């Protein structure tokens, strides 16, 4: 029933459309969903998929460490 | 039991290291796996993940078809 990434109890749906953080977060909310939390995916196999996509805190999720206000990225919605 | 993409009984495991097609194909074979067939993913929701990665035919999987650097790849069919 999960057309995406299944991990524990959360299903992650990829939105391949590039959008700003504000538009991505609003788009997930329009589907009763939120952007991924970085601490719940950082140490898992999910990082290879969620890399460079929007995190819930307004920053891209990055494995190894600009203007995040108008940059545009892909994103997952979960929950 | 699938730490990747599950679609219709097949599990796709992402390999994030960039490899040539020959080494990507050998890496899947060493685990009794194959690269995705384009005909099995093209019209599905998998296409957004497997796009630009190696297909079994030696070409990258593209949404619309019609330059041999290293790419990421999925393995399936363990």
């Amino acid at each position: 029933s999960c057309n995406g990434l299944y991990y524990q109890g959360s299903c992650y749906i990829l939105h391949s459309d590039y959008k700003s953080f504000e538009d991505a977060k609003a788009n997930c909310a329009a589907e009763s969903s939120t952007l991924p939390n970085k601490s719940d995916v950082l140490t898992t196999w999910l990082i290879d998929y969620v890399e460079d996509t929007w995190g819930s805190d307004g920053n891209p999720i990055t494995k190894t460490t600009s203007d995040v206000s108008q940059e545009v990225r892909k994103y997952f919605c979960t929950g | 039991s699938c730490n990747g993409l599950y679609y219709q009984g097949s599990c796709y495991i992402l390999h994030s290291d960039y490899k040539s097609f020959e080494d990507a194909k050998a890496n899947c074979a060493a685990e009794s796996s194959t690269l995705p067939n384009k005909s099995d993913v093209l019209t599905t929701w998998l296409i957004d993940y497997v796009e630009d990665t190696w297909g079994s035919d030696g070409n990258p999987i593209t949404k619309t078809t019609s330059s041999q650097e290293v790419r990421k790849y999925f393995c399936t069919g363990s």
Partner: antibody
Framework: QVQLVESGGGVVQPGRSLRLSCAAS????????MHWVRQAPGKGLEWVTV????????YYTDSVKGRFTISRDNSKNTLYLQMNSLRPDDTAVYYC???????????????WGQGTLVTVSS | IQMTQSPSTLSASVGDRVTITCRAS??????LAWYQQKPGKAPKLLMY??PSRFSGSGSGTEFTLTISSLQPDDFATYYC?????????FGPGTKVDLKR
């Protein structure tokens, strides 16, 4: 100090080819998408093409599709624009530019090269 | 899919509040930045952190640049930039010159 130095411009006859280069220094080249932008004499800026940080994705404006090819060499920190079937309307100053966002993204250009002149004329 | 900047030219004195508007025909996903270019030189990205006199405001079809206090260093041409559907586009440009 982020530096982008371009070369390869010059005068070339219509129908022939030219190759532009852009040497990058002062930043992690492999983590940033790169762009080419051109400006015809007396005209505005026109976006030409982008290549992703890892060289996988390339996109072009319509007027150069099939004629121009963007490429990059991350071990040499150099960006390339191979231009074929050059037309007189390709006459412009060409700039390379760096996206400031890291990885798979699109964003504003915070570093620009000094530009190199391309003149297409018989 | 037409992009216009109004006005194409404008005159202002040192110390004025200048507004440059850049519109689009439809929803263009996201406005990216404003750029300042002087003759003979490469364009320069405008940053809203320095007190910075530059401020951008984008609401769908409209993108606006505000220069709160103009100095003689700000007389140049300004270009908006936006991303839409795997491409980027600069606006036609607005030249700001010294009023007399």
């Amino acid at each position: 100090q982020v530096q982008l130095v371009e070369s390869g411009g010059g005068v070339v006859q219509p129908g022939r080819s030219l190759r532009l280069s852009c040497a990058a220094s002062g930043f992690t080249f492999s983590r940033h998408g790169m762009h080419w932008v051109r400006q015809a004499p007396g005209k505005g800026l026109e976006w030409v093409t982008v290549i992703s940080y890892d060289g996988i994705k390339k996109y072009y404006t319509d007027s150069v599709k099939g004629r121009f090819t963007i490429s990059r060499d991350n071990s040499k920190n150099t960006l390339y624009l191979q231009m074929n079937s050059l037309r007189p309307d390709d006459t412009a100053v060409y700039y390379c530019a760096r996206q400031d966002c890291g990885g798979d993204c699109f964003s504003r250009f915070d570093s620009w090269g000094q530009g190199t002149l391309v003149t297409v004329s018989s | 899919i037409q992009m216009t900047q109004s006005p194409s030219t404008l005159s202002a004195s040192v110390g004025d509040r200048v507004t440059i508007t850049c519109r689009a025909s439809q929803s263009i996903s996201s406005w990216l930045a404003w750029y300042q270019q002087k003759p003979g030189k490469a364009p320069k990205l405008l940053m809203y952190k320095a007190p910075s006199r530059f401020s951008g405001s984008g609401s769908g079809t409209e993108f606006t640049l505000t220069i709160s206090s103009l100095q003689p260093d700000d007389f140049a041409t300004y270009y908006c930039q936006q991303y839409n559907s795997y491409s980027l586009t600069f606006g036609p440009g607005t030249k700001v010159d010294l009023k007399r």
